[PDB]
Design a binder for this molecule. Structure first.
Ligand SMILES: *[C@@H]1O[C@H](CO)[C@@H](O[C@H]2O[C@H](CO)[C@@H](O)[C@H](O)[C@H]2NC(C)=O)[C@H](O)[C@H]1NC(C)=O
Lengths: 51, 49, 132, 123
């Protein structure tokens, strides 16, 4: 079910895709990734009906 | 008085000690004239605003 | 006992000059041994790394801390930290303290700032003493 | 640019389940699948989740529970980490209500309705 959710999320992510990265690496990139909450709204707004 | 924990993570396999009632007193301490009695639920008392 | 004042990437060498103080009284004060380890603006993983490493460096039986950041998460991180070794922590200069409602069962942590009830109380006092 | 995701269980064959997942996904660029472990004394659990997933470009994480009946705060030590930078994650097993608040955790997204809501069935 969950991977179906993330599937439905991915091909909708192309509609905006202005994230440009989720910041990886440990040190240095101490800044809230400026699309975390928005992508979270997207993911929690995933509508499917078959799991 | 207790002792520093041997490890932040490895001491867990040997973290066998008493139950600390610190807050039962640590909440209640005040000196240097200015009183700093704390709250149980986790914040100050008489806060300066 | 081991006490430190960790500094997360600021222009606050004022701290480097701060701890020169004097309140020696006839209390226990068995081993007051302060410590001043600054760091760059770093990540929570390295934050905790240094936290419990320096805790394990020489001695630690009580911790204080401050930083300069927005109100996001560092307090919550420290809050969990407080649990795993039964130790008090007192965040200060509350860019590192925008207080959190709930607390774990047996975490000896505390922080400054007002409880939201107290904010209500003070705003009511203001509303009061001007008669509207 | 292929999305990467890591979970936590002993049915590591769920990785192949994630391959079938990307199959049904592109059917409905690509999506990859990664996996991590579990350890007691969750201090290092944060260390591990950092070292193993923040190394790559995560987008969402998965963690069920240990069937060990402790189950009080076993999901937390990761709800905080990726909560920093606010990387969304997904919840599987535990059902306590603490993990629901929008002010203490910005990370949980719950698949199993927590014990709280079951009140209404009595109503
Ligand atoms: C909290 O601490 C105070 C003192 O800081 C306790 O107060 C009483 O005992 C003190 C001992 O010297 C006196 O100085 C105080 O005057 C006395 N209080 C009053 C009102 O007379 C207090 O009992 C403590 N309470 C708890 C719950 O810990």
């Amino acid at each position: 079910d969950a991977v179906g959710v993330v599937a439905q999320a991915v091909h909708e992510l192309l509609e905006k895709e202005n994230i440009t990265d989720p910041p990886r690496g440990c040190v240095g990139n101490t800044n809230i990734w400026k699309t975390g909450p928005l992508f979270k709204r997207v993911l929690m707004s995933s509508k499917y009906a078959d799991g | 008085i207790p002792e520093p924990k041997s490890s932040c993570y490895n001491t867990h396999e040997k973290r066998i000690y008493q139950s600390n009632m610190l807050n039962r007193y640590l909440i209640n301490v005040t000196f240097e004239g200015r009183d700093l009695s704390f709250s149980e639920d986790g914040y100050q008392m008489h806060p300066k605003l | 006992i081991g006490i430190a004042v960790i500094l997360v990437g600021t222009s606050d060498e004022v701290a480097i000059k701060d701890a020169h103080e004097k309140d020696d009284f006839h209390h226990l004060s068995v081993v007051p041994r302060v410590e001043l380890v600054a760091m760059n603006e770093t990540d929570p993983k390295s934050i905790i790394t240094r936290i419990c490493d320096l805790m394990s460096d020489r001695k630690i039986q009580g911790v204080v801390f401050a930083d300069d950041t927005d109100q996001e998460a560092i307090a919550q991180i420290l809050d969990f930290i407080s649990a795993q070794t039964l130790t008090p922590i007192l965040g200060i200069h509350g860019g590192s303290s925008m207080i959190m409602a709930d607390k774990d069962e047996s975490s000896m942590f505390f922080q400054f700032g007002p409880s939201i009830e107290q904010q209500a109380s003070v705003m009511l006092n203001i509303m009061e003493e001007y008669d509207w | 640019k292929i999305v990467n995701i890591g979970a936590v269980l002993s049915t590591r064959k769920h990785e192949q389940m994630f391959r079938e997942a990307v199959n049904q996904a592109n059917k409905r660029i690509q999506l990859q699948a990664t996996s991590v472990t579990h350890k007691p004394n969750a201090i290092q659990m944060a260390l591990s989740v950092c070292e193993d997933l923040i190394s790559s470009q995560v987008y969402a994480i998965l963690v069920s529970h240990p069937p060990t009946p402790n189950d009080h705060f076993t999901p937390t030590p990761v709800s905080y980490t990726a909560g920093f930078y606010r990387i969304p994650v997904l919840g599987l097993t535990t059902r306590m209500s603490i993990y629901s608040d929008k002010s203490i955790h910005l990370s949980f997204l719950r698949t199993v309705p927590p014990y709280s809501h079951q009140s209404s069935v009595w109503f």
